[PDB]
Design a protein around this nucleic acid. Sequence first.
DNA 1: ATTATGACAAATGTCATAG
DNA 2: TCTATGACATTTGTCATAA
Lengths: 61, 62
Amino acid sequence: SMRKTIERLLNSELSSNSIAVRTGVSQAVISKLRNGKKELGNLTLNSAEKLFEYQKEMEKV
Amino acid sequence: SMRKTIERLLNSELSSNSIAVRTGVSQAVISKLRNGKKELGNLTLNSAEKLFEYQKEMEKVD
DNA sequence: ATTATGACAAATGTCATAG
DNA sequence: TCTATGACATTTGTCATAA
């Protein structure tokens, strides 16, 4: 779960809900992350891996 | 913080307390992950990045 | 479709102590 | 030394809403 790649997804123009549906992570968590209420560091490795996989599968394209 | 590399440090012969001093993480969590009372998935990215950085440094020795 | 805030059960980090 | 167990304040993930 590279912090930089997850950071790219969160800073992407992709919708918070749209990222959430594909990642499987809650839109709530994505919104609170982008806005600032939650920290990426406190995220469960399981959730972090999902975000990293979604962003990497896009970078190769 | 690749799950596989952290899984490798957990499976290592290094003492739970030895890894804790070097990583800054608590012996409690490492011991509980090894015991299996704690899931690696439920760990924070902050703490896992620390255990990951340790393993990568050990990997350089090969 | 999208955006925000919660509630809640169940964890976690960071400290101990106990064996 | 080492592991094991827990306390506690805080934060999660899940599952909602309301706009």
